[PDB]
Amino acid sequence: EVFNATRFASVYAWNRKRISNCVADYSVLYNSASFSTFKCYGVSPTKL
Amino acid sequence: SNFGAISSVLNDILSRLDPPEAEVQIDRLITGRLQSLQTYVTQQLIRA
Numbered sequence A: 001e002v003f004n005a006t007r008f009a010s011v012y013a014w015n016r017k018r019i020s021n022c023v024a025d026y027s028v029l030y031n032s033a034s035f036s037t038f039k040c041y042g043v044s045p046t047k048l
Numbered sequence B: 001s002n003f004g005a006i007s008s009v010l011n012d013i014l015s016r017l018d019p020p021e022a023e024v025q026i027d028r029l030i031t032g033r034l035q036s037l038q039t040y041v042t043q044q045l046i047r048a
């Protein structure tokens, strides 16, 4: 609902969505248009 | 204490970063803690 959302807000005012109260959906991110870059500053990607 | 490293928890530096960086940080932990011992130890000797 964030990644695949059709129309994002612009960089100046960006829509903040809390991902919360759930179980990690990170496994489904594999097969898709995916990402120009996937860069994890907060943890290594395996710990996600 | 951070001792300049990004955190004072040993593992939380690890799982955040890929180890070749942790080797750098864990210095500032070890260099800090190892010192803090030699401070404490050298105290005890004098106090002893």
Ligand SMILES: *[C@@H]1O[C@H](CO)[C@@H](O)[C@H](O)[C@H]1NC(C)=O
Pocket: A001, A003, A004, A025, A028, A029, A030, A031, A032, A033
């Ligand atoms: C986003 O859409 C792609 C298909 O275009 C899909 O493969 C991917 O799993 C979707 N992302 C999420 C988080 O569901």
